[PDB]
Amino acid sequence: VAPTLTARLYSLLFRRTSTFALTIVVGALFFERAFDQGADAIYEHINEGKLWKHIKHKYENK
Amino acid sequence: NNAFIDLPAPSNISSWWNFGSLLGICLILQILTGLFLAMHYTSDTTTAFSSVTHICRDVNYGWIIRYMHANGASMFFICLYMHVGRGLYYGSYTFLETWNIGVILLLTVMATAFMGYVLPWGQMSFWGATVITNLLSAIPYIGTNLVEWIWGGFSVDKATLTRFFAFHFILPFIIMAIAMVHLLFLHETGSNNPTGISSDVDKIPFHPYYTIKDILGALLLILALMLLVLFAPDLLGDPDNYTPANPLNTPPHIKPEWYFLFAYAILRSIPNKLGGVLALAFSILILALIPLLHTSKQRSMMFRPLSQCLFWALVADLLTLTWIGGQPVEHPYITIGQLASVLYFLLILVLMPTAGTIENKLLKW
Amino acid sequence: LMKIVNNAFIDLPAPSNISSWWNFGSLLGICLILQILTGLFLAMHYTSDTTTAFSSVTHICRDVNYGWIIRYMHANGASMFFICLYMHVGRGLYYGSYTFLETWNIGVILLLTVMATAFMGYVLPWGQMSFWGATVITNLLSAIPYIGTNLVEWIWGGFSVDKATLTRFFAFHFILPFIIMAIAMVHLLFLHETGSNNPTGISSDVDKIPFHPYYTIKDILGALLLILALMLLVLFAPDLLGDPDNYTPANPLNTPPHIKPEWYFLFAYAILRSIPNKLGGVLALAFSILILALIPLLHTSKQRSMMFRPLSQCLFWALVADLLTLTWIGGQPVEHPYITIGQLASVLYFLLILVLMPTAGTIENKLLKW
Amino acid sequence: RNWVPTAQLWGAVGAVGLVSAT
Amino acid sequence: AAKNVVSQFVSSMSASADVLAMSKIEIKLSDIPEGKNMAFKWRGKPLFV
Amino acid sequence: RQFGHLTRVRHVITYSLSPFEQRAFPHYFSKGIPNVLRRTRACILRVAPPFVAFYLVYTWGTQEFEKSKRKNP
Amino acid sequence: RQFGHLTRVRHVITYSLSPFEQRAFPHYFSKGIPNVLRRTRACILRVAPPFVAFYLVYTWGTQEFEKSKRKNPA
Amino acid sequence: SDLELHPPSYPWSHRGLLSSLDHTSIRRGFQVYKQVCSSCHSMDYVAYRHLVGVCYTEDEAKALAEEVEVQDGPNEDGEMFMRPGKLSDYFPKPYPNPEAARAANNGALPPDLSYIVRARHGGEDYVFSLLTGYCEPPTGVSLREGLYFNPYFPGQAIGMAPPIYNEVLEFDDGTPATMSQVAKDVCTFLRWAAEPEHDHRKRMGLKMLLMMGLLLPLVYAMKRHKWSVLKSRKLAYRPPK
Amino acid sequence: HLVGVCYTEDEAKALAEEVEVQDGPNEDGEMFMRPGKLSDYFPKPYPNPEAARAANNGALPPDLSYIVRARHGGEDYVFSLLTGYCEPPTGVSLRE
Amino acid sequence: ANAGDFGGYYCPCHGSHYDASGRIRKGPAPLNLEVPSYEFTSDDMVIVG
Amino acid sequence: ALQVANAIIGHYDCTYGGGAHLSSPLASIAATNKLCQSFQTFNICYADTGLLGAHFVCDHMSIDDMMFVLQGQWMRLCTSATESEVLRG
Ligand code: HEC
Ligand code: HEM
Ligand code: HEM
Ligand code: HEM
Ligand code: HEM
Ligand SMILES: C/C=C(C)/C=C/C=C/[C@H](OC)[C@@H](C)[C@@H](OC)[C@@H](C)CCc1oc2c(O)c(OC)cc(OC)c2c(=O)c1C
Ligand SMILES: C/C=C(C)/C=C/C=C/[C@H](OC)[C@@H](C)[C@@H](OC)[C@@H](C)CCc1oc2c(O)c(OC)cc(OC)c2c(=O)c1C
């Protein structure tokens, strides 16, 4: 007597067109933040110590 | 064929119906002279004005192509205004799609001519770019941002001139595509005629009747254009644009191109920023409302005396506003312009719809 | 508004079996829109005076926000355009799509117009390759007897490539893409009269499916792959398909010693270079492209596609390998043994198209007893 | 009818969009 | 993806980096006689002293 | 819209002459002028007044403007 | 060209399932690989040779070029 | 001679697909250009402001700009004058025009260096090899006065004398200034000069790869979903007989 | 531009040579003076408007190439201005 | 400068009159002319910005 | 309720006197535009399942239009049935 995740996602989010759109708007803003933060972290780690933001402290005071 | 040769046309359309083809010719003329000028024009603020004088002094026949382009823009507006006037008078606006596309065409041609005038970078070029783009600053919250974004900076400068050349270059081709759509909607109904009565019982083929009549019209357009180009090329222009742009000084008697004078008079009559901009926008956009304001049981004004009198009052009023736009903001011009501006909207929104109803009553329907 | 958007797209009947090779038509439409969009934005900051052209381009790449990505997207997009153009033409030859004569011949005009367009765009940054490319290519016209030289000077606006040339080229490059767009719409209208051909070369009227959703989603998938290829170039190797010499401003007194054409013009350049005669090389160049208009008249096979034709397939890949050979040779100095390899490759190119393939067609017909 | 509830989620969408997008 | 792409293009039209490089201006007051409005070109616009 | 499908017409006869059999300017002046005069007169009361008004407002405003720019108007 | 006016077809039955009732990747690898291998084998002798020839001409020509640029004791 | 010596591939730390430039190395590289190359080579497309947030703070860059005098004017008397440099000024040109440069260099022209790395096959591999590859002419080769033998320069006779050597300058961070170190840092700086968008395109490229890793299989799944209707369809022919 | 308009090619050539114009750089990277030639534009009296204003009590003599098209009245205006200087009317006092 | 009905300034574009303080007094302009940041320094100088 | 819904859409055939004036939008469109010879909604029931839908007979060039209007009507009932059409059903 218990549904699955997709069945729940279907009923509450995808079935109604108004709600399938709000879901995308919201998901897009959340994904953007998490994706950019994540990818930026990956890029900066691959290049640790080489970027201006990494060595900046040594010269700052301005 | 069937889009031209055997296109059915009313047997009685008059010379007022020649302006559509004349607008097509003005468009082709502007495109042809335009491309040739673009082959020698450079958009950097350090060399724009110079390149234009180079066209007029050293490019073979550069002067005639240039003045044909400048005066061609004036002919374009004369024809546009005649074309719109014909439409209002004869009720051609009931062809809703065709009419509304026409309104878009008017706005696009206005925007196009505005940007072209900025290209030679003379004094009027510079201040016109300043004023007109600033109309957008009336938009609340983001207006100023939109203006700086259009300018590419905090003031009209290089970035502005360069993008304006690009916009002015492509817009006429967009206008051409929009005009083709204009005609396609028209073809669904065929033309209206001076009587406003269906002409399906008396159609004649477009060729040879209107092909030859259009050619005669084209010849008269060329005569008018060339009288201006060969005998008075500067008559419809402004001496101040023969002075290079000076960002530190706005000429004391600055005034818009003649075809923008009526709208400028309307905006100037309101001592409020947002109000003036809204009146300006509305003075053009009200054309989109004409169909909804039609109260007469008859399509054309041919059989409507009262409506005709108010129609000519509107034309005389636009003539008044054009004159006022060319005068300084001093007494009694300030008041004459305010009355004329009010009269403009009053004739369109109230007096004409009312004359329509009265005429219906007098005919007992 | 509905119709012709829909019956011209949504319910357009399409073969059930067209393969990925049929994706290049929509990819070309996308390359055109890309070039037009990035092109207009670059044109908002570009100035065509010889004193400032090169400078305005560096200003775009260094100071205009995201100017660099728009610029390299335009440069590499031109390369993607040609990759797709060549795949598109190859598909047509292999599957006998050229039997749609109007569509095909309009296509030949499209190829020539894109080549002319790309040529003029390359001249705009006014680097060394820009200048010598303008010089050489416009001079092809000097091979025309009696008026050739006059035509060149008229195009140049003078006795040599200079300010007048650069300024009009900006104007030509600006408008041509829109003309290409109108020509492409005509390309499609003629195609719609017949609908598409398919890998088998056999009429697909007994098995059509609606363009939407089958090919709309397939085209979107293709578009994504095109964008991946483009962005791999723009973001990871923006200069890979370019020439270092164009990072040097134009110098009218000196032609770089290892000057070579853009990669997509190398095969044609190799062909022209192989003939030690001015007019002869120009004619061979013109013919290397115009011969495409002759393909339909050279079709001998009783079958439309090469799918069921082994011999024709072998010759088809030999033609592709040969174009690859000419591309390689075009990038090498005019020295031994490249001079001879290129001459053989040039002869082999015209021999495969004019003689070997029509012959393979007849032989295959005989083997099938018809 | 269903138009308010639908016009109210269509309203929201536009809003969220502008807010975010802009 | 569309959001990023579109915003990068829109952004290309905003003031470029060279345009943003602003500074202050020094003006010699002894050159401006009483009753006079002096105009200077500054940060793109007219500056009245 | 194509000839053959415009509308329904019954019992109308039309007689015409070839352009080669007739004059292109029959009674051009003898009948043209009277017609121009007629058309001009028929509309004048509807067209002219507003423009006369413009003229009056134009001359009045211009004079009023000049007068206002001098010592003793 | 419009559905309803393409051509004449008689006595053909077509059975189909809704996309929601079936898998989008049935036997993707189990059957896809064998089919890719088959397709690859069927065409290789028609596609590859010309390119092998190119490779041979390419390596031969490049080597011959380098050789010609050196040690010419005279 | 017409013989060519191509440069080997040095393992620059910005060589990898997702590898950014080393900004401390850009910073030292700028000191090299400034101290050593700027007296003969211009860099017309780089301004002091371009250094901000790349290898120097805004104040450091301002201070750097003020170390030079640049021409400005006209003033109110219609005359040109000198003033300390500012962030908006481009790097000072060593010569007013190419003719003057040639005159100051035995007729050879030091090219502008803004794009030198993108304007030469081999890029920094070429420039590093050239700077660190000067050597004596081989037996049988005699160069006119003014020329130096350099195996990496086309024709092997270059009008530029070896510009760097141990201790040619002192770095702000105490890095030992050996010829190879100076060459490596100036080359890194020249890469940044020719391609300031370098680090940003790679960061974007990472995002593009990740997004494609997501969107491609999802769109492909959408393609197979729709197409399944056709891929599993079954046909049967039942003619009358 | 004067050739075939108001002077022969030789007369115009002689006119151009009556002045010295700057050219260069030469092979030493320097600018130098030379006699004018037909392709030279009429010499400017000042290097820039600031120098012009300085030389004219702050007023700027405008460039005259388009002065007639740049002024309402054109030559009627210019002729009237040139031949119309007169004493200030009683009550009017102008700054030096 | 020195035009308009307040001896301040007159904008010829649409007739805005300002006073010698730069304040808008008549016409369609909504605000007083902007006053930038500035500081009077040594000599008889003023640094704006 | 399904029977009521089906009564709203109804049935129809070329011999119906109603024509353009029929209450059912499907029947009305079908009649004026001549989209079919006939159609009928149905609700075939079985123990724990059944077939709820419609059947129609038409010219080879009208199938797509018929399907379009039929589905549009089901969709309209799902999201917009009116009290008055429901009372009629
Ligand atoms: C003047 C005294 C110089 C100094 C200091 C440096 N360079 Fe130079 N360089 C100079 C000249 C006159 C030339 C022209 C040489 C020729 O024969 O053409 C050069 C050239 C270069 C080049 C270009 C090489 C090429 O392939 O064309 C490079 C890459 C170069 N110089 C780099 C460079 C750097 C980075 C320096 C500081 C470490 C430097 N040069 C100093 C003159 C002078
Ligand atoms: C680039 C500008 C334009 C072009 C090229 C153009 C062209 C045409 C053409 C070719 C015709 C047919 C001939 C005629 O009856 O005049 C036409 C008709 C018409 N146009 Fe335009 N037009 C333009 C702008 C406009 C504008 C600005 C309006 C009005 C706001 C408009 C409204 C109409 C209408 C209502 C008709 C039908 C006329 C009738 O049958 O009585 N047009 N136009
Ligand atoms: C709807 C059509 C067009 C209109 C109404 C129009 C109008 C104008 C106007 C008013 C000017 C100012 C003229 C002046 O006083 O100098 C101008 C300038 C110019 N136009 Fe256009 N134009 C049109 C189409 C085009 C096209 C298609 C091009 C080029 C592809 C073009 C190229 C130019 C150029 C280069 C100039 C600057 C030189 C000059 O001022 O004459 N125009 N245009
Ligand atoms: C700007 C260039 C071009 C565009 C935008 C374009 C676009 C298209 C499109 C959208 C289709 C349908 C989809 C497809 O089958 O790919 C198509 C089909 C076709 N195109 Fe092009 N095309 C271009 C260039 C050419 C060239 C250079 C040729 C050949 C010389 C050509 C020959 C064909 C032919 C014959 C077809 C029929 C394909 C078939 O059904 O088998 N096209 N093209
Ligand atoms: C068929 C479409 C087009 C093609 C094939 C094309 C091709 C090219 C090529 C190969 C270049 C040189 C790129 C480089 O710098 O290495 C170029 C430059 C240029 N193109 Fe296009 N182009 C197209 C459309 C357009 C359009 C429609 C415009 C403008 C409305 C445009 C504007 C420019 C500009 C401004 C440049 C100079 C800046 C630059 O070099 O990036 N292009 N184009
Ligand atoms: C990037 C593109 C942009 C920003 C396009 C904007 C287009 C806006 C409108 O076109 C649709 C606009 C041209 C149209 O308004 C309906 C005109 C009638 C406005 C007329 C107009 O002209 C002036 C002018 O020309 C001047 O010249 C020196 C000076 C002016 O005052 C000092 C004016 C002015 O006060 C007005 C109201
Ligand atoms: C005003 C417009 C004009 C005059 C347009 C003319 C267009 C002509 C053709 O397009 C239709 C042409 C581009 C096309 O020929 C079919 C190409 C394949 C020709 C390819 C081509 O490129 C070169 C190139 O790019 C270079 O760059 C630095 C240098 C070159 O040699 C030194 C060449 C060259 O030797 C050839 C044959």
Side-chain angles (χ1 to χ4, degrees), chain K:
Chain K
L2 291 178
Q3 290 287 174
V4 172
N6 272 0
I8 295 167
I9 291 173
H11 40 105
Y12 170 82
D13 99 37
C14 62
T15 67
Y16 281 26
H21 304 144
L22 294 173
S23 298
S24 159
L26 183 53
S28 184
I29 310 298
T32 76
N33 294 284
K34 297 302 155 207
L35 297 186
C36 66
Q37 277 299 299
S38 70
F39 82 73
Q40 34 158 167
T41 42
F42 59 73
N43 186 32
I44 303 175
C45 300
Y46 291 119
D48 275 296
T49 188
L51 301 175
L52 174 67
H55 163 259
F56 62 81
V57 185
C58 68
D59 178 74
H60 69 121
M61 293 308 294
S62 308
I63 311 179
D64 188 72
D65 289 327
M66 265 312 290
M67 190 59 75
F68 174 84
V69 182
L70 169 67
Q71 288 184 291
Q73 288 307 305
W74 283 336
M75 292 306 102
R76 189 185 61 74
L77 287 187
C78 288
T79 68
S80 315
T82 68
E83 295 299 351
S84 73
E85 71 185 328
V86 170
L87 172 56
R88 182 180 90 244

Side-chain angles (χ1 to χ4, degrees), chain B residues 69 84 90 94 99 101-102 106 112 117 120 129 152 226 232 267 292 298-299 304 312-313 331 336:
Chain B
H69 195 69
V84 174
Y90 293 102
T94 61
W99 178 264
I101 287 170
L106 179 58
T112 294
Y117 197 50
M226 298 321 283
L267 175 138
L292 304 182
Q298 300 157 313
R299 184 173 187 186
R304 292 153 51 196
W312 292 111
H331 159 283
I336 291 166

Side-chain angles (χ1 to χ4, degrees), chain B residues 28-357:
Chain B
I28 294 162
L29 168 76
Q30 286 313 94
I31 285 170
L32 291 187
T33 58
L35 286 160
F36 279 75
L37 289 171
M39 285 184 228
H40 306 274
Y41 173 82
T42 55
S43 71
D44 191 286
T45 61
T46 61
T47 61
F49 187 99
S50 267
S51 76
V52 176
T53 71
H54 163 251
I55 283 161
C56 298
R57 296 166 180 280
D58 292 323
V59 165
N60 303 324
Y61 297 98
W63 58 272
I64 204 169
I65 291 171
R66 191 273 170 105
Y67 289 110
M68 269 173 79
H69 195 69
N71 283 285
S74 268
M75 292 316 297
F76 210 142
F77 281 94
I78 286 173
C79 292
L80 275 174
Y81 295 157
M82 296 296 85
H83 192 71
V84 174
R86 174 284 302 270
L88 297 165
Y89 189 95
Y90 293 102
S92 299
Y93 51 78
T94 61
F95 290 148
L96 297 179
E97 300 72 17
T98 301
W99 178 264
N100 289 325
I101 287 170
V103 174
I104 288 160
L105 281 165
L106 179 58
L107 290 163
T108 307
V109 170
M110 286 181 169
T112 294
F114 151 51
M115 300 178 95
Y117 197 50
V118 178
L119 302 188
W121 210 240
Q123 277 278 62
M124 295 296 95
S125 296
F126 189 90
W127 296 110
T130 296
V131 175
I132 295 167
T133 302
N134 259 321
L135 291 169
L136 292 168
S137 71
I139 301 179
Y141 307 132
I142 65 167
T144 299
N145 304 269
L146 277 176
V147 176
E148 302 184 314
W149 178 68
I150 291 291
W151 287 344
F154 292 112
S155 58
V156 167
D157 209 328
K158 298 177 161 295
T160 313
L161 185 50
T162 300
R163 67 191 59 185
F164 272 29
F165 176 37
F167 300 154
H168 181 71
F169 195 120
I170 199 54
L171 209 36
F173 292 100
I174 287 164
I175 287 172
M176 177 178 23
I178 296 175
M180 291 181 301
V181 173
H182 181 62
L183 275 174
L184 289 191
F185 275 103
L186 180 61
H187 286 187
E188 289 316 277
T189 56
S191 302
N192 173 33
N193 72 82
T195 69
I197 301 173
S198 169
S199 56
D200 280 342
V201 297
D202 193 27
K203 297 285 197 202
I204 59 181
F206 186 94
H207 182 66
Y209 301 110
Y210 292 111
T211 58
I212 191 58
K213 202 172 166 195
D214 279 5
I215 282 165
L216 180 53
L219 276 184
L220 290 169
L221 174 66
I222 290 167
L223 171 69
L225 171 70
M226 298 321 283
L227 283 167
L228 289 169
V229 176
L230 308 174
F231 293 126
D234 291 317
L235 181 67
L236 306 181
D238 189 311
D240 284 327
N241 224 37
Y242 272 102
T243 296
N246 181 349
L248 293 187
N249 183 241
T250 299
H253 295 118
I254 180 161
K255 63 168 153 195
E257 301 83 293
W258 74 266
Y259 41 75
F260 287 157
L261 284 174
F262 79 93
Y264 166 76
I266 289 174
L267 175 138
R268 270 206 326 204
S269 299
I270 300 154
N272 178 272
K273 182 166 175 158
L274 178 61
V277 172
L278 286 180
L280 170 63
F282 196 44
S283 75
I284 304 302
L285 293 174
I286 194 161
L287 285 175
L289 296 189
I290 300 306
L292 304 182
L293 300 173
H294 189 94
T295 54
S296 181
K297 297 300 281 285
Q298 300 157 313
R299 184 173 187 186
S300 162
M301 282 186 192
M302 175 184 277
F303 308 129
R304 292 153 51 196
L306 316 184
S307 283
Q308 290 181 23
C309 291
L310 296 176
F311 172 87
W312 292 111
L314 177 57
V315 179
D317 192 53
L318 284 169
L319 176 51
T320 294
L321 288 164
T322 294
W323 159 59
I324 291 301
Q327 306 303 129
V329 187
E330 287 171 54
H331 159 283
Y333 303 138
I334 299 175
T335 294
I336 291 166
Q338 276 160 356
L339 295 178
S341 290
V342 160
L343 181 58
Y344 176 77
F345 292 106
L346 186 62
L347 278 158
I348 298 172
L349 298 173
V350 176
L351 307 185
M352 296 180 109
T354 295
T357 298

